[PDB]
């Protein structure tokens, strides 16, 4: 270890507060992308939560999403565990019920300790504009995109996100 995990997450905690405070798009690349990123309970720095806003030119437009981030004791050698909340999105690379996210950069083959949370949350956001063909956690919403039926993909997500508000 906690000696190194704590020192590093505390450094990030200051960057996140610094970064997300400013409205200047130079010092904050995350204007209207990462709306917020903070520890759930301030006393316990291993559980963070984040609000993002879906990218433009996607069915996720004009809707926010809450993302759960668990930091292990082995941070930053091992990546965090990042997930959406249960029944909060329909996305090809996302198991809607468990909220599990299959993001490449968080695999032991491709993880670099140099990457931090704002980058990781940013990658999750990037996933919504850029779905992956490779292997989906939602093989059904996955089948729609393989068959290039965008009208179906565009509507079913917009249905899901709309019916989630009422």
């Amino acid at each position: 270890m906690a000696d190194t995990c704590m020192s590093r997450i505390v450094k990030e905690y200051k960057v996140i507060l610094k970064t997300l405070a400013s409205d200047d798009p130079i010092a904050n690349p995350y204007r209207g992308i990462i709306e917020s990123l903070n520890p759930i309970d301030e006393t316990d720095l291993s559980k963070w939560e984040a609000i993002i806003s879906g990218p433009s030119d996607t069915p996720y437009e004009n809707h926010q999403f809450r993302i759960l981030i668990e930091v292990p004791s082995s941070y930053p050698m091992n990546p965090p565990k990042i997930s959406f909340m249960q029944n909060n999105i329909l996305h090809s690379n996302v198991k809607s019920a468990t909220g599990e996210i299959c993001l490449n950069i968080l695999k032991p083959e491709e993880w670099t300790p140099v990457w931090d949370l704002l980058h990781c949350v940013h990658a999750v956001w990037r996933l919504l504009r850029e779905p992956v063909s490779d292997s989906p956690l939602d093989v059904d919403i996955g089948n729609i995109i393989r068959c290039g039926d965008m009208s179906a993909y565009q509507g079913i997500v917009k249905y899901f996100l709309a019916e989630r508000e009422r």
Partner: protein
């Protein structure tokens, strides 16, 4: 209390004399197969969901595979369709896994009976 429905909107189903304003507020999804419909859906059907802001409940689909994927993922209680508008003279075997009640009828009274409870 009524049931949730996934209605597949072929020419014949669009024809049905259903006052759609009464059902727009309910948990109904209208999947539109544009591969087996010539233009946009009947305007007045489209208008009736807008009057309540339930226009999101109509979903246009460019291919049948993608339409059926919507049926499984949406997973509503009832699946109303009419196969006669797809054969010149099919519902994938899956659907029974995701849906509880399949009405696939030619007869008008049946189609209306289910969609109006």
């Amino acid at each position: 209390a009524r049931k949730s429905k996934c209605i597949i909107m072929s020419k014949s189903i669009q024809g049905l004399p259903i006052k759609w304003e009464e059902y727009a507020a309910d948990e109904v999804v209208l999947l539109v197969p544009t591969s087996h419909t010539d233009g946009s859906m009947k305007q007045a059907i489209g208008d009736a969901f807008r009057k309540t802001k339930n226009e999101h409940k109509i979903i246009y689909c460019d291919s049948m595979d993608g339409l059926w994927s919507c049926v499984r993922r949406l997973g509503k209680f009832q699946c109303i369709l009419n196969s006669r508008d797809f054969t010149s003279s099919v519902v994938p075997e899956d659907i029974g896994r995701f849906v509880k009640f399949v009405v696939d009828s030619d007869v008008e009274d049946v189609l209306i009976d289910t969609l109006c409870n």
